[PDB]
Every structure is written in structure tokens, then in C-alpha cells.
Paper text:
Strain P8219, a Gram-positive bacteria, and able to dissimilate several different kinds of monoester, such as MBP, MEP and MEHP18. Here we report the structures of [name], a monoalkyl phthalate (MBP) hydrolase that catalyzes the reaction of MBP to phthalic acid and the corresponding alcohol, in apo and ligand-bound form. The tunnel is narrow in the body of the structure, but significantly enlarged at the substrate entrance, due to the flexibility of the NC-loop.
The twist β-sheet in the center of the α/β hydrolase core is formed by eight mixed β-strands (β1-β8) and surround by nine α-helices. There is a penetrating tunnel formed by Loopβ3αA, αA, Loopβ5αD, Loopβ8αK and αK from the α/β hydrolase core and the NC-loop, αE, αF-αG from the lid domain. In the absence of MBP, the NC-loop becomes disordered to keep the the active site open.
Numbering used by the authors:
A (entry chain A): 24 to 160, 163 to 174, 177 to 311
B (entry chain B): 24 to 158, 163 to 192, 196 to 311
The structure:
């Protein structure tokens, strides 16, 4: 991988680096989250999407191997999105296809809404931040954290959310274990404990309100695909269908793809289907 | 463009014809429907799918230029599906990708459930027949609010259906609308609907649902729907996909926004991209 200084934040990323239009992958999780998330969490997609463009993937602010925010005020969704935007600008990325999984999706949306000039296409995978609440379901992550005996924790989480499950390669287990036991993770947990109530959570609620407000106005200004696994255990499909209902309201160029026998990690559960559909979408 | 006899029935079909695995397109509507439907209604699809395989298409029983059912007891859904099946047997199609639209979808589904050995995979487009029952009738309303005719009827119908914007189809449908076969078909429907065809719909639906709740569809399935379908609401599509997903692991749903009942016409590029992707798996 590579490292670049983004506004004083040391930032790790992956680059193809083919002579094609860029595809930017934005992973899930958040700074201080009990499961460490990074570029390697994309597993095979890093390689596979090489068929459809110049793949890049960045560790988000305070995750993977990129440094934590330099300000308490930067423990916000806007600061994460801004970090990704500044990152893309530093590399001179132009005809960008944004691909966002889970919270990354949120990040992705926020970019597509705020910087249309930079974005050509938007792909949203299992992002429930702006999604309408289910009728009744939603304590998945608390349960997963509770039922864990740490490599064991990572293995356990993966097994917990998988539907067409496979076992994680030992290399990824090693990398993520290193993340989980790193000083930066400890600092990230302390930082979340310090800045959650004052900065992160309110920015989350306001982010949801503003996104939904935009979807009910002019909608997303770029072509948008929503991908969801039918058997998602942490982000129920109902939320995906509701989200897409919110999106189709004023975004004419939008689509919804639901894959059966797939969990929160759709790309991991139904690799071939995912690659085919999303690749076809990116390719037009 | 081609003609062949099927069980004593003059049947017209289209062939690509390439050295590729077959793709059988099944159009919608039914015999005696006030709007005549045929192969031409597939428009660009007929050519566009030449990339994903050997495209074949066929006018269903008592539609297009194919003949009417031989007896009145053959005005059933099963008769239509069996007609297409015997057509396939006579042509000997193996590794077959079935693509059905509207009522055609229903046909395809039956073919997928009765003859899995023949079918490689299934695509269902805007077929509400096997869908869960929803909570004035659209087509009756369209016919009621139409002017004469008959070009104005076809244009009124397509206007009533279109959301986001084939010449061959318009011309030929105008010609069919004033043909004798269409008259005979309307009379035949008027005669055999209440006794045969509608019960055939009820039973067909019941058996298909019951089959989905058992072992599900035996082949990989894609459901395609237009969000702004006037004739068959998206809720029916999502319901049908629920029923399918219950026991069909390899199943998928694709919802295209800014698209109505004729999805392939309203959003050609997206449709071709997704369905083509599915077929190339």
C-alpha cells in the first residue's frame, strides 16, 4: 500500500494503479468501533473490481492504519467525508465511482450530495444510517460483542454476520488482530468515549436528517445503485427497501439490487453475483 | 420471421441465429386481449441480447401470427405453457434461458417448474400472476378512456403505460388490431373466459405459490421490475420475490427506477446490463 499526508493526517491507501477511471472503495465501521475495519476487509473486491476500473481503497479517518482526527471537533461524519474528499483531491481523482459499504455508504452519499463535480457514480451497500426504521427487529452488535470469548473476536464477528459463510484467511486474521491490539485502537476507543455524546452522535442524527431532507428535495445528483443482501442480520432488508424508496423519490437514475442467501457482507457471501451486477452498473 | 407446425398449430418464431446457448423470449398479454402483442413488442431486446446468447422468440398461443387454440378447453394457462414447451421440444432447445414479460413471465415460471431439465435459468419481468394478492381496473380503464382507433388505441395504451419515453410494433399492431384473427380471438375470449381461462389463472397461481413454498424454483432466478409500473405495482414484485426467496437460494431482485411496465423499453441500457450480467454467470 501507500501512505500520503492528508491535511496533517497520515493516510494509508491501495491503488491499482491502472489507466482507467477511478473506483473509490469506502469501508464500514467507525473510529473507536469494537471491530477494527480497514482496506483488507474488502477482501477479493480489491482485485475483482480491477475488471471495471482503477480500484482505490482508503482506510477511513481513525481506522485501519490512518491516524485519528487532529481535533475533537473532527469526530463527526462531515469530517470523515471531508477526509475522503481531501484524499481524493490530493490524488487528482476525476471521474470517480464511489462504492460505500455500511457507514462508508453514508460517507459516500455525503460526498455525492456535496461534491457532484467530483463524482460520476454512487454505489451504496448495506448502509442503514439514513434508512427508515424497521417496524420491529436491532441489538446485533451488542450481542456479537457479548458472545465473543483477539483473533477469536474477529473470527466470531465474521462467522456471526455471514450467511453464505466462508472462513477468513489467516493473513487477514493476523492483520486485524494487529489492528485490534494496536496503540491506535486503544486511543480510538478512548477518543470515542471522550467525544461520542458531544460530537459524533449529534453529527450522526443531523447527518440523517440532512440526507433525508436532500432526498426529499432534489435527490442524489448522480446515478445510484443500492445493493443489499436479503438475509442481512444487522441491517434488515426492510431498511434497504425503505432507503431505496427514499432515494427513488427524486433520483431518477437509481436502482435496487437484492441478493438472496447473503448477509451484511454481500460481496463476501455472493461474490460472483455482486461482481457481475455492480460491475455492469459501473460499466455503463 | 420463421414458421413451423406445433401440434397442428401454425407457429411463428424468431431466431438469431448464432452458435451460442439459447435465450427464449416470451412476450406478455393473452389471446383476445384488446391490445395485440407479439414478437415485435420485444423491440431492441431481440437484437440487444445477441451479445449474451442465441436469441429466440415466439408468438404465444392465439397471439401474433400464431393460430388460435384448437378447442375451447385449451384456453388455459397450462395450454399456453405446454404449447411453448412442445415448441421447444420440436426445436430441441437445451441449456435454455427463459425470459418472460407480463403474462409471459407466468408461462416461463411454469416451464421452469415443470421442465427443469430443459431450463438453465429464468428471468421474470413484471409478472404479477403468481404474485401475492394485493389489497377501476387499469386495462379496462385504458380501453374506456381511449379514442378510436385503432392507431390511437395503441398510442393511447402506450401513453398510459410509458414513464420515460418500436416502429415495427406500432405498425404491425395497428394492422393486427383490424385483422380477422384478432376478432375471432376477442370472441373466443368472451366465450371461454369465465369458464376456462380465469379459473386456469386461479389454479395456476395456487400451484405456483404452493411450489414456491415447497422446493422453490429449481433454476437460478432473476426478477426485474419497474418502480413506476402502472399495470402491476412494485409491491407485487417485491411480494413475488419474497415467495421465491423463501426456498430459491440463487434468486435476485432488480428494481429499476423511472421505468414502467415495459421496463426494457423505458430503461434499455440498465436492463441490458443487469439481465446480460445475470445470463453471463
Amino acid at each position: 500500500f501507500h501512505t500520503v499526508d492528508v491535511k496533517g493526517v497520515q493516510t494509508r491507501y491501495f491503488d491499482d494503479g491502472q489507466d482507467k477511471d477511478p473506483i473509490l472503495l469506502i469501508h464500514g465501521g467507525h473510529f473507536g468501533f469494537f471491530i477494527p475495519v480497514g482496506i483488507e476487509s474488502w477482501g477479493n473486491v480489491l482485485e475483482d473490481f480491477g475488471e471495471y476500473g482503477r480500484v482505490l481503497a482508503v482506510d477511513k479517518l481513525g481506522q485501519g492504519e490512518t491516524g485519528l482526527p487532529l481535533n475533537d471537533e473532527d469526530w463527526t461524519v462531515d469530517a470523515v467525508a471531508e477526509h475522503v474528499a481531501n484524499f481524493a483531491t490530493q490524488l487528482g481523482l476525476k471521474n470517480l465511482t464511489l462504492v460505500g459499504h455500511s457507514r462508508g455508504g453514508m460517507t459516500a452519499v455525503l460526498l455525492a450530495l456535496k461534491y457532484p463535480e467530483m463524482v460520476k457514480k454512487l454505489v451504496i451497500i448495506s448502509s442503514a444510517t439514513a434508512a427508515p426504521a424497521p417496524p420491529v427487529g436491532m441489538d446485533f452488535y451488542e450481542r456479537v460483542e457479548r458472545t465473543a470469548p483477539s483473533a477469536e473476536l474477529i473470527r466470531h464477528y465474521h462467522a456471526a454476520q455471514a450467511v453464505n459463510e466462508g472462513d477468513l484467511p489467516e493473513d487477514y486474521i493476523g492483520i486485524a488482530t494487529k489492528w485490534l491490539e494496536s496503540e491506535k485502537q486503544l486511543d480510538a476507543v478512548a477518543g470515542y468515549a471522550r467525544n461520542a455524546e458531544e460530537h459524533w452522535l449529534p453529527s450522526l442524527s443531523e447527518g440523517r436528517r440532512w440526507v433525508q431532507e436532500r432526498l426529499a428535495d432534489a435527490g442524489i445528483p448522480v446515478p445510484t445503485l443500492v445493493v443489499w443482501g436479503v438475509n442481512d442480520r444487522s441491517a434488515p432488508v426492510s431498511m434497504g427497501k425503505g432507503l431505496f424508496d427514499l432515494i427513488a423519490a427524486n433520483t431518477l437514475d437509481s436502482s435496487l439490487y437484492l441478493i438472496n442467501n447473503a448477509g451484511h457482507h454481500v460481496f463476501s457471501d455472493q461474490r460472483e453475483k455482486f461482481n457481475a451486477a455492480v460491475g455492469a452498473f459501473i460499466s455503463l
